[PDB]
Curated annotation (Swiss-Prot), chains A, B:
PANTHER family the record matches: CARBON MONOXIDE DEHYDROGENASE (PTHR30109:SF4), HYDROXYLAMINE REDUCTASE (PTHR30109)
Positions of disulphide bridges: none
Reaction catalysis annotation: CO + 2 oxidized [2Fe-2S]-[ferredoxin] + H2O = 2 reduced [2Fe-2S]-[ferredoxin] + CO2 + 2 H(+)
Binding site residues for [4Fe-4S] cluster 2: C45, C48, C53, C67
A single GO cellular-component term on record: cytoplasm
First-level EC class: oxidoreductase
Residues that bind [4Fe-4S] cluster 1: C36, C44
Cited Gene3D superfamilies: 1.20.1270.30, 3.40.50.2030
CDD domains cross-referenced by the UniProt entry: CODH
Cofactor annotation remark: Binds 3 [4Fe-4S] clusters per homodimer. Binds 2 [Ni-4Fe-5S] clusters per homodimer.
Regulation: Inactivated by O(2).
Identification of the protein by name: Carbon monoxide dehydrogenase 2
Cellular compartment(s): Cytoplasm; Cell membrane
Organism: Carboxydothermus hydrogenoformans (strain ATCC BAA-161 / DSM 6008 / Z-2901)
Amino acid sequence: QNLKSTDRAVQQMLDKAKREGIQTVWDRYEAMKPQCGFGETGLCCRHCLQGPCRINPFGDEPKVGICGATAEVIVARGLDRSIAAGAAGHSGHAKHLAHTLKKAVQGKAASYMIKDRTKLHSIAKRLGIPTEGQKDEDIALEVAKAALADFHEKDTPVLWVTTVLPPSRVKVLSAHGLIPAGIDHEIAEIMHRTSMGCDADAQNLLLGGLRCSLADLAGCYMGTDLADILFGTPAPVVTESNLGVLKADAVNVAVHGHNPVLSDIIVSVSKEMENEARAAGATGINVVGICCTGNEVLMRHGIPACTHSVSQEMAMITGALDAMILDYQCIQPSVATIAECTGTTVITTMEMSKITGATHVNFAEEAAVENAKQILRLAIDTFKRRKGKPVEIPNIKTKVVAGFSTEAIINALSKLNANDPLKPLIDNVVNGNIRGVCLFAGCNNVKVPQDQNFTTIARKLLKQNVLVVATGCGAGALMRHGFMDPANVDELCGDGLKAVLTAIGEANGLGGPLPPVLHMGSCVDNSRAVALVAALANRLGVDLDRLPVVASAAEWMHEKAVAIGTWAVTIGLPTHIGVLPPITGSLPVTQILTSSVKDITGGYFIHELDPETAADKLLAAINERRAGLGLPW
Amino acid sequence: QNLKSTDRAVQQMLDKAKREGIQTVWDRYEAMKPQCGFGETGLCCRHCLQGPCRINPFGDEPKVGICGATAEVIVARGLDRSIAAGAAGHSGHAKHLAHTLKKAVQGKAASYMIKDRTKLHSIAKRLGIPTEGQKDEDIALEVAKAALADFHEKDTPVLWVTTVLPPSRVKVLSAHGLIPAGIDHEIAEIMHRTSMGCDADAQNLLLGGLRCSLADLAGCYMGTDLADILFGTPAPVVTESNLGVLKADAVNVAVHGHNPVLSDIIVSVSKEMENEARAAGATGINVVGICCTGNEVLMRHGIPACTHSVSQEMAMITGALDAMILDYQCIQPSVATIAECTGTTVITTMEMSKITGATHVNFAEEAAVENAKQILRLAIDTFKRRKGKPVEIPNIKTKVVAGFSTEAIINALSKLNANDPLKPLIDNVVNGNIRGVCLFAGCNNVKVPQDQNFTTIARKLLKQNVLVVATGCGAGALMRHGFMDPANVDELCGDGLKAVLTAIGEANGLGGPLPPVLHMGSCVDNSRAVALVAALANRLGVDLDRLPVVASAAEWMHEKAVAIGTWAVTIGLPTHIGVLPPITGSLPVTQILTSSVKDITGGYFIHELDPETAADKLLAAINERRAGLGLPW
Ligand code: SF4
Ligand code: SF4
Ligand code: FES
Ligand code: FES
């Protein structure tokens, strides 16, 4: 099972699933081999009913699509549609939060409120919304209206791009025509230009994709902003991760998906029903997190993280998961079928994301508490049905310190330098104690033994004094393998990095270091990493493509991650990816994305399937940035 | 060549292309056989990087996607993305026209203006925009702002749906949650819900697709409305069609694509440069139409139609096409390569639709006349380079009467009944002189011998007294085969239909009948057919799903046509399609689209590849509608 996942709890559940005859994502992957090479290389098009068209990577015909579309056009159109689909997910998430904030401040959903007033006021100031002499409710109404206005064309471009990046970066992007005009406007323009008989020039197509990736960045940043207003900005928290966080004697309830608009309410209400859970034979309600909704409630409330991404079915296989409460994105629809065998109640909550065979509860903000109680009572019923059944919860978990929002990181640094908090971090970059910064982001992917790339790359970078930050299922991989436990700083970190983590932690009263990797939150919270490095760029007076900062989507899968990787390149970062997207069928497109885009944005993709080689390539990229600043390396 | 196209001019050019070694769409189709059966059946998914996934239609594994997505989910997600892409094209077209109208009435593009004041005022009244005491420029500004507001969520739903359909139809759709909230909002929601780990219930997915198809209908109707304001509502015109409209001694200039925002200007300016063309050895500038931009200028100015859709390369093969001026949609990118062999200057004009190897001229409304002159002068240069070269223009053309906007049809009927113009048409439906109405719409498709389905079906329906209306490349097929020549009424039409066409034509002073088929314009002008049958429904006091009205997308290809076919079903029409979309891999999805959707909208798809059978099925559908009204059949 170690060829399937490097997580020992996951291996144990894979053995249970095998002896019980329950098919897993890994079994369905094996059943798909050999996968289609036209699709793997990108040389397939279904954009009209004259198709499907394909192109042989090498050899004889077919050499061109029926309409005349070349390999370069077919590959670029497919990639653009992936970016648009990712943008549509992150911005659908943000849009829902904008509507929730509007409802809350109009008096229409009393379960929601302005929890972070300081964040509200700073966002308003960032956007140019007046604060002086205005009620908080009116300021928030203005912020929500601004959020919704960024989805369509108006007199200004998308402010959740233009107000969040360094001004020199906005100027470079504007010169290339890359600033989005409206989030949904760009998504639709991608769908139009990639339809049959439309854009047929690879460079033109890819420039559009870069612009649409910035629409995705805007949705990410808007989602983080709005979730912080509504639910609180994260601050450092201590919790646990992996399947051992489930409790045989408790009602185990997983929140799963991405938008925490209901799961934050699930967390609050579950506490109020401890007595009702005790009447039914449980110690209480044990809410646990899967995927990014789990990251949201871990970051804000220290809810323990059960599992992530590719291994999500394994939580059910324990027999102890009484309910799995779904919103949208990254939910394997197999969970609805597996629930019959495991007894778990799978509940969908969003009108646009239903799964056949799952129970649906129509969540509405105005009725959020009622909804959480109806849902949680289905879970309590389920816990009672499994009275006196054996469960197999692997006794495996790690300690996790998390909650490193950008505000929290700046605050931690301020204990070393109150009036210039970024300076101690920059001081240590310049002197070599910190070699650079790497963001790990994105999913797991069944093609890669689970977590193998994240942990192999992270280990090498930490030994070379790289400050490592992580989001999404990259943070999930690292937390499940101990990278967020400060007890592992001695083992994992080079002496320079250890010195800095210790100095910061000791100034924060911890008597011990910050953890080896800083968890910055969910996938939308990749925007927090942008805010951090944008602040660093502005303090140094340079653009992001001169900083020793790189990213690695080491095991990526989702269209959302393709969008994130593309905006990382667009804002100027060397961006490693550990699974090839469907681009190898076009050498011209591959050359743009890995080389010549440098001349446009200063970023570039680094394609490397071997994680040891990937770490060497990321260190090389960091060290070239150091050299361009005149720093030793 | 008659297996490739039923058009004799196209056959002649296929022989020339073969002896000159020029590859055509038909050659590229042959080179693609056998096409992938997974893609043909819809059983392929590439929505994440764990793919590509496929499902065997029958037999052993693979049976399910890697994430657990079933065949039903995979097929429904793919179809939904096709509908969203079509909506993005039609509404991108409409959005561009909305911006053009706004620029014109703000004094920013003097080459554009309010040409149809009556249409402006009726659209304003339809939307609830006040007209009394307002300048036309301010009314138009309000209409343009309303058009742009329908792209995003607001306090009202999409008004270019809710104000254009019968109220009972709006109520049925609203009860099922099918009214779009915003055009680009729906496109993005489709992209989100169909991304990995999101919507996984076929019925839920398909309901979303029906809603997004109504966003497409809104874009079509908005595009027709705005183009009529800016360029004039069509009225009956007489012109010609087929390759014989090219002239060896003239500068032959094709306008090709969909948005006539520049080609209408091309038509005006070309007249002003007749003298400049005469200096270079030509008789003048002969502007001809390809595809829907050609339909737009045919409908408004009687510009002759050169060719359409699948056969567009053949116009170049004559050797006499000096320039082909492109905007977007349905342009085979092969034209840029074929131009090297034929001498044609291929010019792109829109930033989001470029073709490698074509010359680009950045069109801007503010500089429209300058742009048309720069473009037309490239064409005059090209005509001079082919001095003393042999050209092979097939001496083949038909007479075309066209320009039947809904306003023109109502006006023609008003000569029989001034105060109740629809009554004479209804009178003849009730008495059997008109059996019903069929709209032919959509593309040609290389899988079908060109025009064979349109003409075979139309011939049978006309003999059975069906009033036939046509748009897009369905109108192109019928015009090229004589169906728009009133001299063919005796041959083609049953006695009842002939009586009505003659009575209407004689009351309109023609001394002769209306043509056998009424050309209602471009693909967006399918909205005109909606306006006509909506008016008929309102006059009879019933909904569209009780009228003897059907549609046939007999040779369809583009994602835009998939969207149109889907909204035809959604508004209540039996809708024949002559090429199977990628749905046969899921029996549950096929059953929804061909049967059970009747219980939702009253419309349904009729899947029939055999055009003689299709005509029988369409007549059966018409006759069942007649029976439901108590009419003889
Ligand atoms: S758009 Fe072109 S390449 Fe794609 S399926 Fe249609 S004919 Fe084939
Ligand atoms: S979304 Fe599911 S079915 Fe589609 S490629 Fe990804 S794993 Fe395969
Ligand atoms: S031929 Fe396999 S992905 Fe299309
Ligand atoms: S396997 Fe051929 S279309 Fe994907």
